[PDB]
Amino acid sequence: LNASDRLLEIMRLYQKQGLEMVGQKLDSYLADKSFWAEELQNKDTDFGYYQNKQFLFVANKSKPSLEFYEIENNMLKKINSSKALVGSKKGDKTLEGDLATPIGVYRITQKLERLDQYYGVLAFVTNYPNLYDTLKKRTGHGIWVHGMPLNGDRNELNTKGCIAIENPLLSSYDKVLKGEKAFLITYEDKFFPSTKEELSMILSSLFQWKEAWARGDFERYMRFYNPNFTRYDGMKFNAFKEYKKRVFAKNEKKNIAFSSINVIPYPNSQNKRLFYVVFDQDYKAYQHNKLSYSSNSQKELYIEIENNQVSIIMEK
Amino acid sequence: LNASDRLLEIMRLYQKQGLEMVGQKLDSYLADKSFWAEELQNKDTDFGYYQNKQFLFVANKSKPSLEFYEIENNMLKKINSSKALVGSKKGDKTLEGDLATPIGVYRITQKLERLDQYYGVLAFVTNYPNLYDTLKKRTGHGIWVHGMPLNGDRNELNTKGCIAIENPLLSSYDKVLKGEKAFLITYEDKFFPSTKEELSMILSSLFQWKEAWARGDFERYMRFYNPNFTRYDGMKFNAFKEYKKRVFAKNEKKNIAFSSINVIPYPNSQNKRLFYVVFDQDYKAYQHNKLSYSSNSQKELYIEIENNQVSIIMEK
């Protein structure tokens, strides 16, 4: 079953039964692993799935090195790479002042340009501690990707956790970036890419979870949640399930849509198969066919694949 | 590839902008000649485009003969053919009692069975005079496809305009038809088939016209109409245009959907490239977001292609 068959089937449905049945068919594709497997088959998927154009930094703490990529239609283009300086402590960053460069997936939130000359041309600010770090109660702050001292001093072999590279290369990255946000994937010894099978399982599950949510299927929705689940505000599984039971019993109608979806393999010290999933969510709920609630938000999930099953370990 | 890209566009649109925008995108394909060119490329298109399953008699006045077809996904299955008795007058039927079998595209409206023995096992009633005949002021009635005398008489060489075939075969067609309406194409010496280019032009135009109508684009809508236009109720081009300018100035919201579209080459004296278009139409209009008018009707168009341009010459 291929893309041409699916297009023909969409149009046949549209001409014969109209628009509502088209939506139901499109939903069935989105919930279908094989549909994603086909879309992904010739794409560069090692660093994840990215719907829109994005920029990716990849840091190897061990070498140490930093690479920079552009990703468009899920095809990678390597811009450059170099050696880097990183923190002195091996493994996870878990505490303020532990001198460790964090392992995981981070976002570059801003550029700083009026800094001590030690930081070089600029500093890209990472969002350590990210949601995952925050729900694990890891402490610390101020992890940046920056340059080398402007005076030309080279008197350190390690930072206190920041990632530092040469200024000309750093400037060249900034010119490619043009003020766009970047992801940063940082790993330690060896990187374990997301496979096409894993991305296919996550994306199909993602849409199944959405539609179980929207239609108020409490049992199906709850099965996507890992027993260890933690919500962004600290709520754990039992209270979460209690609450959702009540909410779902109200049987309100909802429409939910996910866009700008990225799914990114998440390096971690236990080498669990973890992924960070981030997307825009359009959410609408109705009471007696009157719109009673709407929101547009940025959602974040952390998902594990274990025992060949997808589960949600954290959600904002 | 293209089908991969086209599908991806639809899937992204569905989640980013909604099912309504998906419908508009499918509509843009239906308005595109190259879309139809591709869609028709391996279809049996000589007798026209038939969206759903349909049945077709083809009568050659000159032979004389009658063929019967089943048409499913626009592939012809020929059920049978045989010799036939037809009217003695060559050329057009224009008048009550002129003994001519009419030339053009007709519809079988009903089956009669309580007949005089002369007429055989049954009569399929054709709709002579059709809309075209009627707007051309042609008169007469009772043009049937029927059998041979039940008392075994086989005297006559010609009917008074009906089409007569052997009773065993006629019953066979009836059992295949099973109460369904059928089309009849009748032509005189040589049949000049609808081509794939003609059909693709007519179909893309049909959907362009629908969009111009529904979105209220007066100038683009009026461009499809031939100067010689006659509406089913006699109204001519200038009065039609005047009335439409008024209606379009109201800028009412309108939703229009077509289904079971058939486009059938229309044989004619002058061998002009004329076609009969017939479809079901669901029409709704609104006033300040409230439904003010709805209808479900069978629409009929007669269309000429001349100097590579599609025009409407008659509409019901």
Residue numbers in the entry:
A (entry chain A), B (entry chain B): 15 to 330
Quote the authors verbatim:
To provide a structural basis of understanding the molecular function, the crystal structures of Csd6 have been determined, both in the ligand-free state (“Csd6-unbound”) and in the d-Ala-bound state (“Csd6-Ala”). Refined models of both structures are essentially identical to each other with an r.m.s. deviation of 0.17 Å for 632 eq Cα positions. In the case of Csd6-unbound structure, two monomers in the ASU were similar to each other with an r.m.s. deviation of 0.64 Å for 316 Cα atom pairs, except for the N-terminal residues (Leu-15–Asp-41) showing r.m.s. deviations greater than 1.0 Å with a maximum Cα deviation (7.6 Å) at Leu-15. The amino acid residues with the largest deviation encompass the entire helix αA and the N-terminal half of αB. In the crystal of Csd6, two possible models of the dimer could be identified. The dimer model I has a buried surface area of 1,080 Å2 per monomer (6.7% of the monomer surface area) at the interface, as analyzed by the PISA server. The dimer model II has a buried surface area of 726 Å2 (4.5% of the monomer surface area). After direct excitation leakage and buffer background corrections, the distance between Cy3 and Cy5 dipoles in the dye-labeled Csd6 dimer is estimated to be 107 Å from the corrected FRET efficiency (Ecorr ≈0.03), using Ro (Förster distance) of 60 Å for the Cy3 and Cy5 pair. In the crystal structure of Csd6-unbound, the distance between sulfur atoms of two Cys-176 residues is 96 and 66 Å in dimer models I and II, respectively. This result unambiguously favors model I, supporting the assignment of dimer model I in the crystal as the dimer in solution.
